[PDB]
Structures are given as C-alpha cells and as structure tokens.
Amino acid sequence: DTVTIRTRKFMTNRLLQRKQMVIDVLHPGKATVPKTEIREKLAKMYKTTPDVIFVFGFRTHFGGGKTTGFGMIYDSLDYAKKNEPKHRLARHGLYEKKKTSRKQRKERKNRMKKVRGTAKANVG
Amino acid sequence: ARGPKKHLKRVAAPKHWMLDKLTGVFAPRPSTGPHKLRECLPLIIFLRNRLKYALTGDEVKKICMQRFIKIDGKVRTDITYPAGFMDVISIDKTGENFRLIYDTKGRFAVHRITPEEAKYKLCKVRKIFVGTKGIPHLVTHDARTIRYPDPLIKVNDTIQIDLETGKITDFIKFDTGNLCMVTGGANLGRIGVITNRERHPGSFDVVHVKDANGNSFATRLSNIFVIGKGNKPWISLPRGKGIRLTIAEERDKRLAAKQSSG
Amino acid sequence: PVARSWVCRKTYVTPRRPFEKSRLDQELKLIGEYGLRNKREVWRVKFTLAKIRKAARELLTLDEKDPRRLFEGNALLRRLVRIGVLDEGKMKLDYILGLKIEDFLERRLQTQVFKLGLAKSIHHARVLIRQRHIRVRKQVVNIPSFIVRLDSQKHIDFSLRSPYGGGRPGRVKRKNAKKG
RNA sequence: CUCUCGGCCGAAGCGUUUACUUUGAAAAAA
RNA sequence: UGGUGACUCUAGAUAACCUCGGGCCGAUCGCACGCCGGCGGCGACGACCCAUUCGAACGUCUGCCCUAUCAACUUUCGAUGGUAGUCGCCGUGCCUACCAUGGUGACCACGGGUGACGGGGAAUCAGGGUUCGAUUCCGGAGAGGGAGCCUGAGAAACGGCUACCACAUCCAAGGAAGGCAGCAGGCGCGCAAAUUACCCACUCCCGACCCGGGGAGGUAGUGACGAAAAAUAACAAUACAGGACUCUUUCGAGGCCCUGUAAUUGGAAUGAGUCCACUUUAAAUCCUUUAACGAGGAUCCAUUGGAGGGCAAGUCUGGUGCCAGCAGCCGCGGUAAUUCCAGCUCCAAUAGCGUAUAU
RNA sequence: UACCUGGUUGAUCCUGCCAGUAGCAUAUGCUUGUCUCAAAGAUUAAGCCAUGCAUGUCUAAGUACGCACGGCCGGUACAGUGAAACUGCGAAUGGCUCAUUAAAUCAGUUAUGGUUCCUUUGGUCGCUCGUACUUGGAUAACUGUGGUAAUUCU
Ligand SMILES: [Mg+2]
Ligand SMILES: [Mg+2]
Ligand SMILES: [Mg+2]
Ligand SMILES: [Mg+2]
Ligand SMILES: [Mg+2]
Ligand SMILES: [Mg+2]
Ligand SMILES: [Mg+2]
Ligand SMILES: [Mg+2]
Ligand SMILES: [Mg+2]
Ligand SMILES: [Mg+2]
Ligand SMILES: [Mg+2]
Ligand SMILES: [Mg+2]
Ligand SMILES: [Mg+2]
Ligand SMILES: [Mg+2]
Ligand SMILES: [Mg+2]
Ligand SMILES: [Mg+2]
Ligand SMILES: [Mg+2]
Ligand SMILES: [Mg+2]
Ligand SMILES: [Mg+2]
Ligand SMILES: [Mg+2]
Ligand SMILES: [Mg+2]
Ligand SMILES: [Mg+2]
Ligand SMILES: [Mg+2]
Ligand SMILES: [Mg+2]
Ligand SMILES: [Mg+2]
Ligand SMILES: [Mg+2]
Ligand SMILES: [Mg+2]
Ligand SMILES: [Mg+2]
Ligand SMILES: [Mg+2]
Ligand SMILES: [Mg+2]
Ligand SMILES: [Mg+2]
Ligand SMILES: [Mg+2]
Ligand SMILES: [Mg+2]
Ligand SMILES: [Mg+2]
Ligand SMILES: [Mg+2]
Ligand SMILES: [Mg+2]
Ligand SMILES: [Mg+2]
Ligand SMILES: [Mg+2]
Ligand SMILES: [Mg+2]
Ligand SMILES: [Mg+2]
Ligand SMILES: [Mg+2]
Ligand SMILES: [Mg+2]
Ligand SMILES: [Mg+2]
C-alpha cells in the first residue's frame, strides 16, 4: 500500500517513438519492487497500457529506502518491437533466442568451411 | 603499421568529446570527411552523449537509418560522420536545428538555432586556384570547392553559403576590426575583434584579438575564423557570448546562482 | 587493454621510528579517547592533516595577489570551514597551520553520535553506527569514519527502521516475547 | 631609433650579434 | 588570369606526340510513375582528373647508458663531394660511368658492452638528487632463423605464398601437411605467474549490411600483487582491588565520577552464516533490498613476531650446561642463562605479520 | 617530520665502515571473518606445442531456371523466401611479445616549393567535329563419369 512512483527526468523521443524517463520508487519497508507492478503503476500514471512499458536498471540504495531505474513508454507495441533491444522483449515474452551455443555454431562453421557448394548444407 | 588504422582508443580520443573512462576501451573513430579527425564531432557522440536522444550506439544507428538527421541539408546515415565547425544539424521529425559552435571552454556546445538561420552557413576560404580554361576555384574549410567565386574573395576570408544551392551569397574580408572566433589552440572558442596581424615570412602569422570586455589574446593565423563584419556577428552566438571568465569570476557566478536558487 | 581504472592511494603513512615512548603514548591516548580500532586510523587522520598543511605551506610562499593563491586558498578554507574544523572568523590561510589532529577526530560520526547523546560511550557509539541504528538526514550511515558536515550535523537521528527509533523490536526481544 | 610609403598613426629597415630575464603562441590523453 | 618570402607554380598560346603489356569521354541496377507523337523525378553502382579526410614515407634542428685494458677511423668491394644518367612514388652515392680527395675525431670519433625497444610515466625524496619504466596510451620491431615474392590504394603480410636452415606431423614409403611472441590449455624452464568457462547485451570494428560476424572486447572463475572501507562486542546492576571527589578527627563518611578479578548476574543490539522472493544481468553470480532462522565460554574461541642493548616489553619459574642452540651487529650459553628449550606474564602491528633479494 | 642509534679503547675524542631504521617491488612462510576496486608465464626459454576457437560479409537496388520452399495464373520473360556459386569489399585493423636496435628507435620542433594516398566529402563528367529500342565469347553454381592411403586435392 506504501509504494510511491516518481519520474525525475522525462523526454519525448519522437525519433524513437517513445517517452523515456528516470523512475524512483519509494518502498520504505519492502524488498525491491518487482518490475511487473512498477509497470502497472506507470501505466496508471501515464494513462497507457502496461504492454508498451519497458523498465530496466533498477538499483536500490543503501539503507533500503529508494530504488532508481529507467523506463520507456512506447507509442505502440509495433514501435516497441521495432525499437526495443531483443532481450528486453524476451523479458516480456515477445522474443525467443536460438538455443545453440557459440561453440556449436563455430564448429559447424569451421566444418562447413571444408566442403564445396551444396554439401555445405549436409553437415550439421 | 601497414595500411591505415581503423580504431580509436577511448583515452586517445579528443578531450573535447568529454568521453568517460569506464564505458569501454574504444571511441567512435570518426569517418573520413570534410572535417579533420581531431576537430570534429561524430554524429553518434552528438546524438547520444550530448542530446541524450539515444542510450546506446545501436539506438543511434536506429535513429539514423530512418533518415531523420540532416547535416547541412543532406541526409547522413553514417553514425561516425564527422560534423565540425559551423555545421548545421537539422532534425525535422522533432523540428530542431543546431549549429556546431565552439563554446568558451573549447567544446562543441548544443546550440539551437532558428529554421531561418539553418538555411545558410559560414565557411573560411582555404585556397584559391585557377584551373580548367581559366576558371577560378575556391576551397573552404568544409572541403567544398566552388567555381566562379567573386574576384574580391581572397584567402582567409569568410563566405556565406546557401545550403540549399551551395552558392556564395556574400563575404567578409579578413581585416582588422572584424569579429572572429578562435578555432584552435589555447584560446579556442573565444570571440573578439581583430586588432593587428603580424607577418613572419616563411613561418606562422600571429593575429591579436581583443574581447568585448577588453581582454586581448594572440593566436596563429590558421586558428582565426571571421564571424562577422565589424562588431556584429553574422550568426547567433552560444549562451556564453564568446568571452572567457576566469575561474574566480566563474566561481562567483556559480555561487550567486546557488544563492538565488530556491 | 581493458576498461578498468588503476588509480589508487595509500590513505596513511607509517612512522619512521617504530618504538618510541612519546609517540606510542600519544597515539594510545587518541585511540582511547576517540574509540579508534587501531593506530592506522590515527595515521590516516595524521596523513590528511599533513596533506592539508603541505598544501597550505605551498600556498603561503606565493604572492598574496597571485590568482592561484587566492583561488585554492579560498577553496581550502571553505572546505575546512564546511566540515567544522575551522571557524568562519579564522578564515585566513595561516590559521590552517594551527590545526591539530583532535579537530579532525572530533568531526567523525562516532564522536558526534556520542556527543549528541544518542550513545552513552564512544564505543557504544561505534557499535551503534556499525549496527545500522544511525542515520544522517534520510540516509542510514554505516561508517564510523564519516566526517560530519557542519550543515549535516543537525540531522543525526536514530534511523526510523531501527528498534531505538522506529519501535520495532529486534531478534532478542521477539524471541524472549515468544517464550512467554 | 629614424628617412621614406599608405590612411598623428599604420608601414619600412637595422641598432653588430647574442646569451640572460619577462611576455605571447604552439604544444595528446591518461 | 590568380598566387607565394621564394616556382622552373597556376592558367594561357604554338608545333607535335599519345605506349596492343592501350586513359577519360556510363552497353549497369531499384522505386515511383507520369505528362506531350517524344520528353522526365528520386536514388544506387561505376569512373579520368582536381581538392578534402585518413594517413604513410623520406628529410631539418636539438636531446641517450657504460667503457681508452677501444686513439685514430672510412676510402682497392662508395668512404666525402662534382657532372650525366639508371632505378625508385619522389629529393639523395640509392646504384652506374668518369672525375676530385675528400669526410669524422680528446667538444671522445671508431670499436666494444648493456640484466638497452624509446617516450608519456613510476618509487623515493626538505632543497638538490638516485633508481625503475617487458607491462593496457603514442611511436618502433617481429611472428622458429634468414631470404624472395604475389595480390592489393596500402604487406616484403607469415591465423598469404616460394625456397634454404633448425625442429616436427600423417603415410599403404609413391607422397602430403606445418608455424599459439592471438584466447584458453600442455610440456619445459625455473624462486617466480589464473579457466581447454559464458556472450556479442555494453565499447567499438568489418562487410554488399538497421539484419551477419568479432577469444577485439564484455561477463564470471582462480587470485593475501597491491589499494579503500571495516566485525571479533556494547550496556545496566551488583560486588568490590578499587581509585579519584567529599565532609569528618583516625576509622569512618564520602552511595559524583571513573577501571577491573568479576568461569557474578541481567536482559537488549546485531551481522558472519543458513536461506524465500525481488533487484541485478544477454543469462546469471556478487553487492544493495527484504521474509524466516541465526550469540554467553556470545567455543560464532586472531595471528605473526618479540621481551639484554640498538628498540617497546620479565636479572619470574623449570630444563640444558661453550652442548643443543640463539644471535642482522655487540654478544648469550662452560650448574645460580634477563639471550637457548618451554610454562606463565608482558608489547608491536593487527586480518595481517615474519624472511630472502633488487632499489 | 630538513631525525639518527649499537660496535675498535683500561677509559677519551676522531676517521671510518659494518649493523640497526622506514618505504617500495618480486618470491616465500605462518595466518585469514565481511565488503569495494584490482595486478597476474615480463625476468629463466623471441624455448617447444596436442586440441578447440580467434575474419568474415547482401540491400529495394551486380548475377537466381537449386520446387529447397512457396505461387497467385497458370504460356502472362522475371511473384516472393532463398541454400549454393560467380562478382564486389575486408582480411595491411585488432590482439601478442620486447629478440633485434646506441644519433638508430623515440621526443619536442619544422619541411615536402620533393612524393603516394582505397575510402568519405565537394568540384568535374553533351567542352573532343570523329546493333545502339542493346553487341561477343566463356565459366561457376547445377547435372553426370572419376583418380588417389591421404588434404579446404582436383
Ligand atoms: Mg597492429
Ligand atoms: Mg611555410
Ligand atoms: Mg599530458
Ligand atoms: Mg641526378
Ligand atoms: Mg652525384
Ligand atoms: Mg663508382
Ligand atoms: Mg634486449
Ligand atoms: Mg631505459
Ligand atoms: Mg617495457
Ligand atoms: Mg627481457
Ligand atoms: Mg604498443
Ligand atoms: Mg611485420
Ligand atoms: Mg616460439
Ligand atoms: Mg615474412
Ligand atoms: Mg598463429
Ligand atoms: Mg597478423
Ligand atoms: Mg597461449
Ligand atoms: Mg618445477
Ligand atoms: Mg606470484
Ligand atoms: Mg557487440
Ligand atoms: Mg552482431
Ligand atoms: Mg582479451
Ligand atoms: Mg566462483
Ligand atoms: Mg606477501
Ligand atoms: Mg590492504
Ligand atoms: Mg552481509
Ligand atoms: Mg606470543
Ligand atoms: Mg622466553
Ligand atoms: Mg632488542
Ligand atoms: Mg626498553
Ligand atoms: Mg633474525
Ligand atoms: Mg634478546
Ligand atoms: Mg686501535
Ligand atoms: Mg671493550
Ligand atoms: Mg644499512
Ligand atoms: Mg624490521
Ligand atoms: Mg557474501
Ligand atoms: Mg603477458
Ligand atoms: Mg618467455
Ligand atoms: Mg567470395
Ligand atoms: Mg569500401
Ligand atoms: Mg583488401
Ligand atoms: Mg566524388
């Protein structure tokens, strides 16, 4: 019941189709507030929906009073999918990374380097 | 080292970029262009470190690939494009225009200009040569060559270029009494009236310049840029009007602002 | 090449003569009177005072109208007045040479916590600070060697999340109340 | 320091040349 | 015509030339589509030349350690200069032909050595100095040792090629393939130095490129190199060695203040740990934030060196008896050892402190 | 913090060194609870290396007749996604190390009026009086026959 959100800095990135701000969270007696509900607070504060709000970099100060992070509110979900880094979309479930490792791909590449044209597709 | 170098160490980057130490090993390494590497401001530095429109380099690339940034009226999608002195950066999507003008402390200040003033620029002339069936040619500090210039235009003069067409509209001759900015050295960013120029044949020429507050300083001739005819500049000056405060008066001004705050 | 910084300093210096009665006695007096952990804290304070005295001595030999002397002397005097070591009525450069080690030791958070009555001893003050019971303004300060600024002195409270300030009983009180 | 040029000054020499001293400029970042 | 301090510069005029191993003078792609029978808007590639940027390469001036048990050196095979050329991207003995006899040196030439890559810098330092700089920035060099090349704007490139020298792999004995002073890792050498980990999320680089790649780089692991902060207890009550303070006449009184045997009591406060959840992050870990548990020998138990002098702290006790040993130096030990071996006590620094070596 | 102390003599004052004292770097010993930074096969062997990785790259816009997918319509030359291959660019940067090197390297200062320069940027690109409503031959990918114990061979 006692969790306050304030936004210190604020700018409208018209070129990146969003609003970017610094968020400070007041939670005097609780753990660091989860991102999922900071998103709800931001959506209610800015009269948007939580699906276009991306928050990150939340660091809690010594003594346990406040947390500070950054937030973006996109004009639309398609703009967010165009402009957001892929890992932040994966946090919201909108993106999935490939399951291969660096070693797997590197060894496959160096194996393919030993064969001529179509046989390159026959090694994996 | 065989062949040209393609990297730039962060600690080896020019100091006026105001780059920190712990963000990375490397620096943006400006692309080859109209301005020298040491005297330019790469597009990424301006768009990310200065204006805070982007948080990372990838965001700067995303901004530039939508063709929103124009440098002197032309769309520039290269994020390491060297933008230098008197360049005009236009962002139509958000609708602002900047002119890269040195601040008093020798750094490119964020200086917003009106869209009327973003239609032209001033260029120092570097050389004049006749070629190709007796056609004269001018070369500016911006690496643009203009054929058929006014016969009165001599070296070390200043020409006003209409960015849309690229032609000369008027000019200021290099003479005592004309306003100038220092574009290099210890007095970089300082604005004053030219007092006297002493010639040393076979060597560098020294130009003496007096501020609006009465302070005088010398520079080399290659470090002088004619800004206006007489006391009146032909462009808008940054918030600091080109005068340098000593550290004492700067501290006094800061303290006065602190006292008046709140 | 890496993206790391390697600037670091030693905050103290060691005395040249390891065993001498007068120095040992004076250091022990300071340790007992200000509740210090060891002699390294005394030598740390001594080193800061020595650096300040060296800077002042460098400035004194300069000309009075020298702009560098005026600038850094003003900065040094304002820093010393700001932490409470110097008096505003004694804001001349030579008075810096009159400062003692006890002046810098009196501005620690430990001694100020003891002087304000939040603790009944200097050692109780140290354990109170290290146990997160003490706050300066709104920030809970955990470091005994926290030089209290002159403006920051009036805001030293009991850290309202602590049992002494915020009225929440600790481990021992809760366990002993459960035994009832 | 003066005799000449250009608008009382700006120019020109050369006072044997310096060393020295003071100033100014140019001088990577760390 | 224009320019420079200074052109044999720039431009102009004339007579020719213009390499078959040729110089430019568009036979290229995409998107919108149009107008008046033909004209066209945006771009992308390409291109001789000029300028510009990024350079690079030669030069100018001054500056380098030790050594004379190195005093004369270079010049017949260029040493110094002149003339003409060759080659080179160009200025040049760069090389050639012909000439001249020059050029350097006690102001240290030439030769030798260096545990010599050079700087920015580092340690110490009153002032002056001495020493270090392989090491993340700049410059140079090299890719086992020499040498020679192709391609290319740019290598005399070695994660390109061709040989020889030294090593060395597979072989069916005919042949083939090599280069970790890249990241990990192994051997060897040693007094002496970490994981055959995760990732392109950040900084930037490359490419035809908003998209791919990057052991550059970032993140963890090991890590007492070193630097910063900083626990190992605090308080109250007793009881007192007790002390000061205090009246009284000595006791006493003095119950104000302090210290400590306190294996005397007593509740309070905590984080080291264990551990949900957040937060962190590319994914994590750590730190920070917060539940729950978590301290009386609070055994949740601080060490390393010393105790004759230098130099701080025991001529206390037991053992040994010029032995064993200590001792940087002076010295201690031969039956009452302030010095050895121990117990107790004490003191110096303290999460650190001894020792060897360079300075 | 501009500092000294023990040791030659029966005793003294000197010279003078030895020893002590503090810092800094390497190694090593004993010890080690929290937390933030952080050096790290330089020294001896620029000694030798198993194994894996460290340099690749496509836009709307050079070349697509791989059904490998997918058509929409099915003669609409060429829908689109697109492996491969040709073409172009990069691979001369970065990283490592310190063997060589003693006016050499390097540093500051100057010069190129004595040269080269991919790229980016601007100029120039009907300036020349002499089949075009589009020219020619290949080669790769692909399809098929193979050789060698063996290679990123062909
Ligand atoms: Mg390199
Ligand atoms: Mg010149
Ligand atoms: Mg510097
Ligand atoms: Mg010649
Ligand atoms: Mg000759
Ligand atoms: Mg000859
Ligand atoms: Mg060597
Ligand atoms: Mg050296
Ligand atoms: Mg080195
Ligand atoms: Mg070495
Ligand atoms: Mg280097
Ligand atoms: Mg090489
Ligand atoms: Mg080797
Ligand atoms: Mg080679
Ligand atoms: Mg290799
Ligand atoms: Mg290489
Ligand atoms: Mg290795
Ligand atoms: Mg061994
Ligand atoms: Mg070690
Ligand atoms: Mg990346
Ligand atoms: Mg990528
Ligand atoms: Mg690395
Ligand atoms: Mg671990
Ligand atoms: Mg050690
Ligand atoms: Mg430490
Ligand atoms: Mg903790
Ligand atoms: Mg002991
Ligand atoms: Mg003993
Ligand atoms: Mg002793
Ligand atoms: Mg003593
Ligand atoms: Mg010893
Ligand atoms: Mg002894
Ligand atoms: Mg004698
Ligand atoms: Mg004697
Ligand atoms: Mg000594
Ligand atoms: Mg010692
Ligand atoms: Mg922990
Ligand atoms: Mg190394
Ligand atoms: Mg080695
Ligand atoms: Mg290819
Ligand atoms: Mg290119
Ligand atoms: Mg290439
Ligand atoms: Mg061009």
For the residues of C133-175, what is the DSSP string, one character each? --EETTEEP--TT----TTGGG-EE--TTSHHHH----HHHHH
**Phi, psi of A71, rounded to the nearest 5 degrees:** -140, 150
Interface residue of B19, B21, B258 to substitute, partner C, most C CBs within 10 Å: B21
Interface residue of B50, B59, B64 to substitute, partner A, most A CBs within 10 Å: B59
Sheet of A4-13: strand order equals: A4-13, A18-26, A66-74, A53-60
Q: Give CA–CA dist A24/C129, Å, rounded.
A: 27
- The bound ligand whose nearest atom lies closest to the alpha carbon of C18 is 36
Q: Give CA–CA dist C48/C44, Å, rounded.
A: 6
Contact C129, C109 (CB under 8 A): yes
Q: Is the CB of B185 within 7 Å of strand D?
A: yes
What is the least distance, in Å, from the CA of A26 to any CA of chain C?
Answer: 13
Q: Give CA–CA dist B253/B243, Å, rounded.
A: 14
Residue C94 falls within a domain, yes or no? yes
Q: What angle do CA A116, A120, A123 make, to 5 degrees?
A: 130
Q: Do A16 and B54 touch (CB under 8 A)?
A: yes
Q: Do C71 and B248 touch (CB under 8 A)?
A: yes
The enclosing H or E element of C1 equals: none
Q: What angle do CA A98, A101, A106 make, to 5 degrees?
A: 115
Bridge partners of C72?
A: none
What's the DSSP call for residue A31?
A: S
**Phi, psi of B183, rounded to the nearest 5 degrees:** -110, 30
* Residue (of A61, A50, A59) closest to A91 by Cα position: A50
What three-state secondary structure class fits B86?
coil
* Residue (of B159, B163, B119) closest to B137 by Cα position: B159
Residue position matching structure tokens 């030579």: C94
Contact A16, A83 (CB under 8 A): yes
Which residues have CB under 8 Å from B184's CB, separation 6+? B39, B219, B220, B222, B223
Q: What angle do CA C20, C25, C30 make, to 5 degrees?
A: 135
By C-alpha distance, the chain A residue nearest C134 is A63
Q: Which contacts (CB < 8 Å, 24+ apart) does range B59-66 have?
A: B59/A16, B59/A83, B62/A16, B62/A83, B63/A15, B63/A16, B66/A15
Domain B1-116 identical in fold to domain B121-171: no
Q: Are strands B69-71 and B135-140 parallel, antiparallel or unpaired?
A: unpaired
Q: Which contacts (CB < 8 Å, 24+ apart) does range A24-31 have?
A: A24/A66, A24/A67, A24/A68, A25/A58, A25/A66, A25/A67, A25/A68, A25/A69, A26/A2, A26/A65, A26/A66, A27/A2, A27/A3, A27/A66, A27/A67, A28/A2, A28/A64, A28/A65, A28/C161, A29/A2, A29/A64, A29/C161, A30/A2, A30/A3
The enclosing H or E element of A21 equals: strand A18-26
Q: Give CA–CA dist A70/C137, Å, rounded.
A: 26
With left for phi above 0 and alpha for psi between -120 and 50, is residue B202 left, alpha or beta? left
What's the DSSP call for residue B259?
A: H
Q: Which CATH architecture has domain B121-171?
A: Beta Barrel (2.40)
Letter for the amino acid at C76?
L
What is the least distance, in Å, from the CA of A10 to any CA of chain C?
Answer: 25
By C-alpha distance, the chain B residue nearest C67 is B248
Resolution reached, in Å?
2.6
Encode B156-223 in three state secondary structure. Answer: CCEEEEECCCCCEEEEECCCCCCEEEECCCCCCCCEEEEEEEECCCCCCCEEEEECCCCCEEEEEHHH
Interatomic CA–C1' length for residue A103 and nucleotide E145, angstroms: 36
Letter for the amino acid at C19?
F
Alpha carbon distances (Å) from A92 to A36, A50, A71, A124, B136: 9, 10, 14, 32, 64
* Residue (of B110, B79, B111, B106) closest to B15 by Cα position: B106
Which residues have CB under 8 Å from B141's CB, separation 6+? B85, B123, B124, B125, B126, B225
Q: Give CA–CA dist A28/A6, Å, rounded.
A: 14
Structure tokens at C161: 């999340």
By C-alpha distance, the chain C residue nearest B250 is C71
Q: How far apart are the first and last CA of chain A?
A: 56
Range of the domain at C121: 18-180
Alpha carbon distances (Å) from C154 to B29, B259, C149, C161: 51, 21, 10, 19
Q: Give CA–CA dist A32/B250, Å, rounded.
A: 42
Bridge partners of B130?
A: B136
Counting one residue from chain B and one from chain C, the pairs whose CB atoms sit within 8 A come to 19
Contact B79, B49 (CB under 8 A): no
Contact C107, C147 (CB under 8 A): yes
Which residues have CB under 8 Å from A59's CB, separation 6+? A67, A68, A69
What's the DSSP call for residue A51?
A: G
Burial class (CB in 10 A: 0-12, 13-18, 19+), A47: exposed
Q: Is the CB of B91 within 7 Å of strand E?
A: no
Q: How many residues does chain A have?
A: 124
Show residues of chain A in contact with B93, CB under 8 Å: 14-15
Q: Which residues of B65-78 are buried (b: 16+ CB within 10 A; e: fewer)?
A: eeebbbbbbeebeb
Q: Do A85 and B58 touch (CB under 8 A)?
A: yes
Contact B172, B229 (CB under 8 A): yes
Structure tokens at C92: 């001349």
Radius of gyration, alpha carbons of chain B = 20
Name the residue ranges covered by the structural domains of chain B.
1-116, 121-171, 174-244
For the residues of B10-29, what is the DSSP string, one character each? GGGS-GGG---SSS-SB---
Structure tokens at C29: 């007096």
* Number of folded domains that form chain C: 1
Burial class (CB in 10 A: 0-12, 13-18, 19+), B81: buried
Given CATH 3.20.20.150, say whether it is the number of domain B1-116: no
Residue C6 falls within a domain, yes or no? no
* Residue (of B79, B71, B130) closest to B100 by Cα position: B71
**Phi, psi of C93, rounded to the nearest 5 degrees:** -65, -40
Which residues have CB under 8 Å from B178's CB, separation 6+? B172, B193, B194, B226, B228, B229, B230
Q: Give CA–CA dist A49/A39, Å, rounded.
A: 9
What is the least distance, in Å, from the CA of B143 to any CA of chain A?
Answer: 30
In order of start, what are the domains of chain A with their CATH numbers? 4-121 (3.30.70.3370)
* Residue (of B22, B24, B28) closest to B6 by Cα position: B28
* Residue (of B102, B243, B250, B123) closest to B185 by Cα position: B102
By C-alpha distance, the chain C residue nearest A66 is C139
Show residues of chain A in contact with C135, CB under 8 Å: 63
Structure tokens at B153: 């235009």
Chain centre to alpha carbon of residue B112: 14
Q: Give CA–CA dist B179/B172, Å, rounded.
A: 10
For the residues of A53-105, what is the DSSP string, one character each? EEEEEEEEPTTSSEEEEEEEEESSHHHHHHHS-HHHHHHTTS-------HHHH
Chain centre to alpha carbon of residue B128: 22
Q: Is the CB of A93 within 7 Å of strand E?
A: no
Q: Are strands B191-198 and B179-182 parallel, antiparallel or unpaired?
A: antiparallel
Which residues of C sit within 8 Å Cβ distance of A?
Answer: 132, 135, 138-140, 142, 159, 161
Bridge partners of B83?
A: B41
- The bound ligand whose nearest atom lies closest to the alpha carbon of B1 is 1
Q: What is the dihedral of CA C78, C82, C88, C92, to 10 degrees?
A: -30
* Fold for the domain defined by B174-244: SH3 type barrels. (2.30.30)
> Helical H runs in C14-121?
21-34, 39-60, 67-82, 101-105, 109-115
Letter for the amino acid at C136?
V
Residues 124-143 (C) near nucleic chain E, CB < 7 A: 124, 126-127, 130-133, 143
Structure tokens at C149: 């600024």
Letter for the amino acid at B115?
P
What's the DSSP call for residue B111?
A: -
Q: Give CA–CA dist C140/C135, Å, rounded.
A: 4
